[PDB]
Symmetry: D2
Subunit: 355 residues, 4 copies
């Protein structure tokens, strides 16, 4: 019932914007250990670590998602860290066993974000074939069923089109039950979430755009007798005045790296625009939307703490269970969010309950 | 020129013997962090972490090799940790990037042991096809060429029979040059080491058995203009008296687990016995040899510290550059080795220098 | 420089339309042997088989394209027969060797039509992964380069992303140089034709639509220093009067099987509509277009013999080198074409030549 | 039951021996059409067409097995023709459909010989990975189960480690039930034959060597409740005097091409010698044995017609159901076998029946 919060780990060297603007944010482990500790102290339940094999959207350097996640877990106590994984260059036997060992070493705090892929050139560079849009989701669904089965069954057998297991016994299994997240917003993504995943993570959007996705998932999940929760990306710019927050947004966009934005935008046509419906990630993103590379400005958590808290509660009303927050200057703004924004959300929630 | 020492990480729940004998050894992270610190204090330069996906040779539980290596590096300062990797369920793009990130996080202290595989049933359980003996080495050599090329250049291209890369740029690369080890003793293994590897690791053997491998590698490496060093497995039983060490050895063997040894021995026929020459790992192993699952008793580092030190220097004279030590009670025997055996080795080397 | 003619082999039940109308057409070898002999006598240079692995509704039975082509060549003397091949369920080593042997047995009269695929459900049923639209063309281009190299040289080596060859020597090679045709009309198809194919076969279309494809191919092929010819599908309804030919067309469409048409149109969305440009086979086909399953009515070769001859010559004037003809009643209409239509084309061509 | 007879189709340019001796045998279709007709008239029930993709054992040129088998069936009326297929470069969906169409065109007379592979260099040349010996039989068994299922059921589903099918309906199916033969003599081969195949074809051998294989197959097949028949290769040299037949054998061997024989012997080490038991095809073949490349001289059908007929009947007594005959001068020796040897076998069988 209370809304949950995650933050994007800036393990990619350009932060969370495609922009030349000065940021007090770094992609190295030293910066990120302290940020994970600040996020835990601020009240964030999850950190989300993105997966790249090569540079895109202005991230010339990227730390590998699973090892980096392990290091963040080792530096924290209660924080849960979601390691992103792309089927193809990743296989599920290795993923299940590596995640299970990290879970055993971190008191049960690792999770996974299965992402089905859009950056074709990256796959080509690393010798992976490029499956059709919905076919990438068929494979991701077999990957998810494989993870859950390996972790839950003494002797797991799975006779898939992409993956096979035959009486496979993983030991040790995870300490508890790792949560499986997935990223993407196409019909194929919503279908998979309503079947196998614990969480559907989606790009930023208007309230109406989010409600449309939630309503489809809820109906499908109910018919499948499956439980799934909803998280939405938001690039949060909280400042003491609304004018200052809008001025920061304008600086970010004014300083956009246009060659990086356009190259990202071209590659992103292999996500939602390439699905049979032509709907999903980046299908309707302008140059200015792309400057936050998961459409995070659209969620409009930009203004005063009070405006942002009221907007978060309005997202709860259409079925959002978690806000996935990106920031410009991560350490100071995560701390500010915990001191100034999150307590206002909790007060609004207490007042709603007592009525 | 000084001989180097590695120890086997007991990340598999049966320790380093296929036996019911009581051992003060454990496979969990708590035991292994302390063990790694003691090993570093004792003068071991490397720890070697074995790779399993499911139980064999008496190891019902096994921690995943790379994440466990990451954790041991996080708990130490100068120790180098070698993570074992099996091509097939591992792919080189992910290995290259995950190892590069761990390298960056650990001040350049991770290495890799490419092992080409023998446990067919394990591959079948996780959906991997079983290549012919020498073909597994063909694949491993492509895997090693990919790791080395990815780590050393931008725009790496490789048009292999097993792996493809196309203008691939990994960032960040490792801090320096990670060492590539490999395990196996067949002709295919020796040929691969003489072409692409930094270290050839081999099973325990007599001095003459080791000499025959080194001489073959030396000639082949010279013809390729390639440098490779030699490490040999030895199960070290050092006691204050020779009689006590021999009694321990007999206790380990007398308490051998026959189901596990039979099952291991049958599976191990897919290593040296299955090569075109019929030579390599386990091709000549009796039931008693198999109780140490890399033929470690054959190296005969079993006796007083003085006998062991002399035997180590004798191995050096046939071209052994590193002794890879297994133990029964890891923490206490690593400490004893550093206090009682290693200094005798260093004295012998110093006396040989002045002569 | 004379325009060439092919006919579609009705090796799929239901003929060349998705309609319940009575057809004096059959898919068996007896009807098709006689039809091939009639087509050779009528002046057709080629027969084009189609490739299916499964189908529903009236298209319920399909003879395998290569072995059926071999049988048709065995029943004829001069006719060339083009065997359709889909990369994926077909591999290029077997295709090259099987076609070379058939070429040797048939006096050099076999050709191949490389088709890159649109029917996703058929691939899934036979265990094949569904690659993205342009990726299927990347694979088809490697397939074609493989056929051409294997057939033309010993020691053929190819280091593809999809296919590898290592000093492969096929013996015997074909008697002559088999022509490579390809089917498809997207940008990816045109790019491939301008690089590697002898013939670009495309769906039916207006003169304007054909000319736009020819102009793009001609520019690209010139820059590649590559020669490629153009063939266009047309469903030919030649009758003594224009009114009767139009009545037959209305009858075909009026008796269309609506469920079959809709199921075909839904699956065909994986062709042109799924390409990045949204253009290619079936991207703009209405219900009535889909009744001829390669848009054959659009080419408007429906009317008197004189009208049809003038329209064929008009297609030649925009770069069409070959008309690929479908018919309702194959045997009798092939005979009528050779007696009533083809001679008018030749007369028109002769009269143009006298100027 | 009356013993059945097959002959090897000389679809390979060196005939059935690795020798420079002058042979009145040709690999082209004209010689082979007349040969198949003579064999049919002589009383051979089957022809067997070997599969190569590149030159081995002196076969500089090789016609493709399936298309050549189709052409031989087209030249005959009752002869059954067995096309050899190697899983790997062949896939089962295509094999099933192509064979079914040929079966429909030839009145149900096509069969298949599934061979699991020994010629590693050929696979490497055509881009195929080299599976371990027993794993090749694992794949071949899935291939056989797929053929059998596709041919016999609509909506065939098969969830293999090598092949997948999902509700696949092949139409048309064969006219009846095609026979599945397999070649190979290792434990893996015998185990496969005892589970899925109609015929086990084996290399030439002594009576005792054959009986040891039959006895193992019989016990295994009885435990599986499976029916399988036995065929044995024999290189038949029938002459009016024993002295003449022996002189011919000596001439073949004396004119052996020793570079070809040794190169074949080396490649053949990947058959029986590479199996876990070290037993199977070519494991015990001397230089002289290898001159007939399936050990055909060992069966000793070399002598007068009377001697050969008695030795055939003696093979029946250890469970041989079919003799698979090679010859030096094919057309003339097939005609002679039918005039002079086969009638003696029939008289001996008639005399045994009346006792
Ligand atoms: C919150 C979120 C996080 C994501 N993280 C990643 C990532 O780290 N790497 C990646 O390649 N794709 C990532 N994706 C995109 C997925 O690959 C997604 O499957 C792909 O864009 C196809 O999206 P679609 O289903 O909307 O067409 C993410 C998507 C979302 C919504
Ligand atoms: C010191 C050493 C360590 C090894 N570690 C492993 C391991 O952790 N996992 C594994 O499957 N194989 C391991 N192997 C065996 C390899 O997989 C080897 O390639 C296989 O046994 C074939 O050996 P051969 O070349 O002597 O036939 C190791 C071998 C040696 C000598
Ligand atoms: C003349 C012609 C014949 C074709 N024949 C076949 C066929 O026999 N089987 C098949 O699956 N596809 C066939 N196709 C379609 C191809 O699979 C084509 O590559 C696919 O529809 C993608 O088309 P696009 O490039 O316009 O998107 C044919 C296409 C044309 C133009
Ligand atoms: C009668 C017979 C015919 C065979 N024909 C072929 C063939 O045409 N092509 C081929 O590559 N192998 C052929 N083989 C050999 C098979 O590939 C066999 O599976 C391989 O040699 C392994 O044999 P093994 O099971 O005795 O080790 C044939 C074997 C026999 C006994
Ligand atoms: Cl979206
Ligand atoms: Cl060894
Ligand atoms: Cl079109
Ligand atoms: Cl044999």
């Amino acid at each position: 019932q209370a809304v949950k919060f995650a933050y994007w780990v800036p393990n990619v060297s350009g932060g969370l914007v495609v922009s030349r603007i000065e940021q007090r944010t770094d992609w190295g482990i030293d910066y990120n250990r302290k940020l994970a500790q600040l996020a835990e102290a601020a009240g964030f339940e999850y950190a989300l670590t993105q997966i790249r094999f090569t540079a895109g959207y202005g991230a010339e350097f990227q730390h590998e998602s699973v090892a980096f996640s392990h290091a963040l877990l080792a530096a924290t106590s209660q924080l849960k860290v979601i390691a992103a994984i792309l089927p193809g260059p990743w296989q599920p036997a290795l993923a299940a066993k590596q995640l299970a060992t990290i879970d055993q070493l971190t008191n049960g705090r690792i999770a996974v974000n299965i992402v089905s892929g859009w950056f074709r050139g990256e796959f080509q560079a690393i010798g992976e074939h490029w499956l059709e849009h919905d076919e990438r989701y068929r494979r991701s669904e077999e990957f998810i069923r494989s993870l859950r089965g390996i972790w839950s069954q003494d002797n797991f057998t799975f006779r898939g089109d992409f993956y096979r297991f035959d009486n496979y016994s993983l030991k040790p299994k995870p300490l508890g039950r790792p949560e499986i997240f997935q990223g993407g917003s196409s019909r194929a993504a919503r279908d998979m979430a309503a079947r196998v995943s614990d969480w559907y993570f989606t790009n930023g959007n208007s309230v109406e755009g989010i409600k449309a996705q939630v309503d489809d998932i809820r109906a499908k999940a109910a018919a499948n007798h499956h439980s799934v929760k909803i998280g939405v990306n938001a690039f949060v710019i909280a400042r003491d005045t609304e004018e200052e927050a809008k001025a920061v947004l304008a600086q970010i966009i004014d300083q956009a790296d246009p060659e990086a934005v356009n190259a990202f935008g071209d590659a992103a046509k292999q996500a939602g625009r390439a699905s049979p419906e032509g709907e999903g990630n980046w299908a309707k993103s302008t140059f200015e939307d792309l400057v936050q590379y998961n459409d995070g400005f659209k969620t409009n958590l930009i203004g005063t703490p009070q405006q942002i808290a009221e907007r978060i509660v309005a997202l709860k009303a259409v079925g959002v269970d978690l806000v996935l927050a990106g920031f410009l200057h991560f350490q100071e703004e995560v701390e500010y969010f915990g001191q100034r924004v999150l307590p206002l959300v909790r007060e609004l929630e207490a007042k709603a309950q007592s009525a």
